[PDB]
Design an enzyme around this catalytic site. Structure first.
Site, PDB file in Angstrom:
ATOM      1  N   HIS A  81       0.768  -1.242   0.000  1.00  0.00           N
ATOM      2  CA  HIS A  81       0.000   0.000   0.000  1.00  0.00           C
ATOM      3  C   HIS A  81       0.799   1.290   0.000  1.00  0.00           C
ATOM      4  CE1 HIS A  81      -3.658  -2.253   0.411  1.00  0.00           C
ATOM      5  NE2 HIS A  81      -3.193  -2.868   1.487  1.00  0.00           N
ATOM      6  N   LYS A  84      -5.075  -9.987  -7.413  1.00  0.00           N
ATOM      7  CA  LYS A  84      -5.753  -9.284  -6.335  1.00  0.00           C
ATOM      8  C   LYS A  84      -6.748  -8.309  -6.962  1.00  0.00           C
ATOM      9  CE  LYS A  84      -5.171  -6.710  -2.053  1.00  0.00           C
ATOM     10  NZ  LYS A  84      -4.250  -6.079  -1.079  1.00  0.00           N
ATOM     11  N   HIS A  90      -3.188  -2.766   7.705  1.00  0.00           N
ATOM     12  CA  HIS A  90      -4.248  -3.135   6.777  1.00  0.00           C
ATOM     13  C   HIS A  90      -4.842  -1.857   6.209  1.00  0.00           C
ATOM     14  CE1 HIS A  90      -8.340  -4.465   5.571  1.00  0.00           C
ATOM     15  NE2 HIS A  90      -8.771  -3.501   6.363  1.00  0.00           N
ATOM     16  N   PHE A  91      -5.113  -1.847   4.910  1.00  0.00           N
ATOM     17  CA  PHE A  91      -5.797  -0.722   4.287  1.00  0.00           C
ATOM     18  C   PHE A  91      -7.291  -1.027   4.227  1.00  0.00           C
ATOM     19  CE2 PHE A  91      -5.405   3.174   1.815  1.00  0.00           C
ATOM     20  CZ  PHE A  91      -6.633   3.221   1.191  1.00  0.00           C
ATOM     21  N   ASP A  92      -8.116  -0.200   4.880  1.00  0.00           N
ATOM     22  CA  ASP A  92      -9.535  -0.529   4.971  1.00  0.00           C
ATOM     23  C   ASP A  92     -10.383   0.136   3.897  1.00  0.00           C
ATOM     24  OD1 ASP A  92     -11.118  -2.272   6.615  1.00  0.00           O
ATOM     25  OD2 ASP A  92     -12.257  -0.504   7.269  1.00  0.00           O
TER      26      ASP A  92
HETATM   27  O1  LIG Z   1     -10.189   0.834  -1.192  1.00  0.00           O
HETATM   28  C1  LIG Z   1      -9.682  -0.256  -1.017  1.00  0.00           C
HETATM   29  C2  LIG Z   1     -10.480  -1.386  -0.699  1.00  0.00           C
HETATM   30  C3  LIG Z   1      -9.873  -2.581  -0.515  1.00  0.00           C
HETATM   31  N1  LIG Z   1      -8.507  -2.681  -0.628  1.00  0.00           N
HETATM   32  C4  LIG Z   1      -7.846  -3.974  -0.422  1.00  0.00           C
HETATM   33  O2  LIG Z   1      -8.730  -5.041  -0.833  1.00  0.00           O
HETATM   34  C5  LIG Z   1      -8.699  -6.134   0.116  1.00  0.00           C
HETATM   35  C6  LIG Z   1     -10.133  -6.584   0.390  1.00  0.00           C
HETATM   36  O3  LIG Z   1     -10.822  -5.429   0.863  1.00  0.00           O
HETATM   37  P1  LIG Z   1     -12.407  -5.675   0.791  1.00  0.00           P
HETATM   38  O4  LIG Z   1     -12.746  -6.879   1.582  1.00  0.00           O
HETATM   39  O5  LIG Z   1     -13.140  -4.383   1.418  1.00  0.00           O
HETATM   40  O6  LIG Z   1     -12.829  -5.901  -0.748  1.00  0.00           O
HETATM   41  P2  LIG Z   1     -13.795  -4.707  -1.246  1.00  0.00           P
HETATM   42  O7  LIG Z   1     -14.059  -4.936  -2.682  1.00  0.00           O
HETATM   43  O8  LIG Z   1     -13.040  -3.292  -1.079  1.00  0.00           O
HETATM   44  O9  LIG Z   1     -15.147  -4.643  -0.354  1.00  0.00           O
HETATM   45  P3  LIG Z   1     -16.500  -5.158  -1.082  1.00  0.00           P
HETATM   46  O10 LIG Z   1     -16.615  -4.698  -2.623  1.00  0.00           O
HETATM   47  O11 LIG Z   1     -16.553  -6.636  -1.002  1.00  0.00           O
HETATM   48  O12 LIG Z   1     -17.756  -4.526  -0.289  1.00  0.00           O
HETATM   49  P4  LIG Z   1     -17.925  -3.007  -0.810  1.00  0.00           P
HETATM   50  O13 LIG Z   1     -18.764  -2.989  -2.187  1.00  0.00           O
HETATM   51  O14 LIG Z   1     -18.659  -2.244   0.224  1.00  0.00           O
HETATM   52  O15 LIG Z   1     -16.452  -2.376  -1.016  1.00  0.00           O
HETATM   53  P5  LIG Z   1     -16.494  -0.829  -1.482  1.00  0.00           P
HETATM   54  O16 LIG Z   1     -17.623  -0.593  -2.606  1.00  0.00           O
HETATM   55  O17 LIG Z   1     -15.055  -0.457  -2.105  1.00  0.00           O
HETATM   56  O18 LIG Z   1     -16.763   0.049  -0.319  1.00  0.00           O
HETATM   57  C7  LIG Z   1      -8.248  -5.457   1.432  1.00  0.00           C
HETATM   58  O19 LIG Z   1      -7.528  -6.356   2.278  1.00  0.00           O
HETATM   59  C8  LIG Z   1      -7.338  -4.291   1.000  1.00  0.00           C
HETATM   60  O20 LIG Z   1      -5.991  -4.762   0.915  1.00  0.00           O
HETATM   61  C9  LIG Z   1      -7.770  -1.601  -0.924  1.00  0.00           C
HETATM   62  O21 LIG Z   1      -6.564  -1.719  -1.013  1.00  0.00           O
HETATM   63  N2  LIG Z   1      -8.345  -0.397  -1.125  1.00  0.00           N
HETATM   64  O1  LIG Z   2      -9.855  -4.508   9.785  1.00  0.00           O
HETATM   65  C1  LIG Z   2      -8.814  -5.070  10.052  1.00  0.00           C
HETATM   66  C2  LIG Z   2      -8.302  -6.044   9.160  1.00  0.00           C
HETATM   67  C3  LIG Z   2      -7.141  -6.653   9.454  1.00  0.00           C
HETATM   68  N1  LIG Z   2      -6.468  -6.331  10.598  1.00  0.00           N
HETATM   69  C4  LIG Z   2      -5.199  -7.004  10.895  1.00  0.00           C
HETATM   70  O2  LIG Z   2      -4.233  -6.533   9.943  1.00  0.00           O
HETATM   71  C5  LIG Z   2      -3.225  -7.552   9.741  1.00  0.00           C
HETATM   72  C6  LIG Z   2      -3.033  -7.767   8.248  1.00  0.00           C
HETATM   73  O3  LIG Z   2      -4.315  -7.978   7.668  1.00  0.00           O
HETATM   74  P1  LIG Z   2      -4.126  -9.133   6.584  1.00  0.00           P
HETATM   75  O4  LIG Z   2      -3.111 -10.235   7.162  1.00  0.00           O
HETATM   76  O5  LIG Z   2      -5.444  -9.752   6.325  1.00  0.00           O
HETATM   77  O6  LIG Z   2      -3.505  -8.482   5.244  1.00  0.00           O
HETATM   78  P2  LIG Z   2      -4.537  -7.442   4.571  1.00  0.00           P
HETATM   79  O7  LIG Z   2      -3.789  -6.035   4.366  1.00  0.00           O
HETATM   80  O8  LIG Z   2      -5.684  -7.203   5.459  1.00  0.00           O
HETATM   81  O9  LIG Z   2      -4.993  -7.783   3.036  1.00  0.00           O
HETATM   82  P3  LIG Z   2      -4.785  -9.267   2.436  1.00  0.00           P
HETATM   83  O10 LIG Z   2      -4.131 -10.245   3.522  1.00  0.00           O
HETATM   84  O11 LIG Z   2      -6.123  -9.753   2.021  1.00  0.00           O
HETATM   85  O12 LIG Z   2      -3.861  -9.263   1.106  1.00  0.00           O
HETATM   86  P4  LIG Z   2      -3.211 -10.713   0.751  1.00  0.00           P
HETATM   87  O13 LIG Z   2      -3.899 -11.778   1.495  1.00  0.00           O
HETATM   88  O14 LIG Z   2      -3.386 -10.995  -0.814  1.00  0.00           O
HETATM   89  O15 LIG Z   2      -1.650 -10.728   1.200  1.00  0.00           O
HETATM   90  P5  LIG Z   2      -0.555 -11.263   0.119  1.00  0.00           P
HETATM   91  O16 LIG Z   2      -1.125 -12.168  -0.891  1.00  0.00           O
HETATM   92  O17 LIG Z   2       0.596 -12.069   0.890  1.00  0.00           O
HETATM   93  O18 LIG Z   2       0.155 -10.030  -0.627  1.00  0.00           O
HETATM   94  C7  LIG Z   2      -3.744  -8.841  10.400  1.00  0.00           C
HETATM   95  O19 LIG Z   2      -3.002  -9.072  11.600  1.00  0.00           O
HETATM   96  C8  LIG Z   2      -5.233  -8.529  10.683  1.00  0.00           C
HETATM   97  O20 LIG Z   2      -5.683  -9.192  11.864  1.00  0.00           O
HETATM   98  C9  LIG Z   2      -6.965  -5.404  11.449  1.00  0.00           C
HETATM   99  O21 LIG Z   2      -6.350  -5.135  12.461  1.00  0.00           O
HETATM  100  N2  LIG Z   2      -8.137  -4.776  11.187  1.00  0.00           N
END
Ligand SMILES: O=c1ccn([C@@H]2O[C@H](COP(=O)(O)OP(=O)(O)OP(=O)(O)OP(=O)(O)OP(=O)(O)O)[C@@H](O)[C@H]2O)c(=O)[nH]1
Ligand SMILES: O=c1ccn([C@@H]2O[C@H](COP(=O)(O)OP(=O)(O)OP(=O)(O)OP(=O)(O)OP(=O)(O)O)[C@@H](O)[C@H]2O)c(=O)[nH]1
EC number: 4.6.1.18
Length: 124
Positions: free
Chosen positions: A12, A41, A119-121
């Site tokens: 990010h 992704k 984490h980016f929300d």
């Molecule tokens: O701006 C963003 C959002 C996400 N991320 C990344 O994507 C991973 C999953 O994030 P999501 O679980 O949130 O997959 P989304 O598609 O974002 O959420 P949905 O579409 O399912 O529900 P909505 O239609 O409400 O989402 P929206 O319309 O954007 O508000 C997350 O770990 C970030 O690394 C990000 O870097 N920048």
């Molecule tokens: O609301 C939240 C969400 C998460 N967390 C914590 O933040 C840590 C990293 O969150 P994630 O481990 O889930 O990493 P994310 O950035 O979230 O997005 P993705 O993992 O989907 O991307 P990829 O799986 O594709 O990674 P790669 O393929 O290896 O490049 C973890 O400790 C959570 O508990 C949090 O405190 N509040």
């Protein structure tokens, strides 16, 4: 391995550019940051601010995370960001993205001691 904080920086952080100016940005960046290695992704944001400025968001406006956790923080200022969104043409491993530039407030989740983004929300 990879720490959560380092993973956040890889996925990010892009302080090198002020803003997405190449329509190629996401195609190149999603690949070089290894976000197309095992799958395309679907959505990913890069933040064009100093690491210190993004880490500082962990002390700014506390807001609920999309998952219901309480450790998310919204930046007081807008930040330059680039959203990368997978197109329809995109088929792994030839992942294709549209590069959208915007200035928005970011929302990140923070954890740890020191308290840093993991984490980016969302952007708003
Ligand atoms: O701006 C963003 C959002 C996400 N991320 C990344 O994507 C991973 C999953 O994030 P999501 O679980 O949130 O997959 P989304 O598609 O974002 O959420 P949905 O579409 O399912 O529900 P909505 O239609 O409400 O989402 P929206 O319309 O954007 O508000 C997350 O770990 C970030 O690394 C990000 O870097 N920048
Ligand atoms: O609301 C939240 C969400 C998460 N967390 C914590 O933040 C840590 C990293 O969150 P994630 O481990 O889930 O990493 P994310 O950035 O979230 O997005 P993705 O993992 O989907 O991307 P990829 O799986 O594709 O990674 P790669 O393929 O290896 O490049 C973890 O400790 C959570 O508990 C949090 O405190 N509040």
């Amino acid at each position: 391995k990879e720490t959560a904080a380092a993973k956040f920086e890889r996925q990010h952080m892009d302080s090198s550019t002020s803003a997405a100016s190449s329509s190629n940005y996401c195609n190149q960046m999603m690949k070089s940051r290894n976000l197309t290695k095992d799958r395309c992704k679907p959505v990913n944001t890069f933040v064009h601010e100093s690491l210190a400025d993004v880490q500082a968001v962990c002390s700014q406006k506390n807001v609920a995370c999309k998952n219901g956790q309480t450790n998310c923080y919204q930046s007081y200022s807008t930040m330059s960001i680039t959203d990368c969104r997978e197109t329809g043409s995109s088929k792994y491993p030839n992942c294709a993205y549209k590069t959208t530039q915007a200035n928005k407030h970011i929302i990140v989740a923070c954890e740890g001691n020191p308290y840093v983004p993991v984490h980016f929300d969302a952007s708003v």
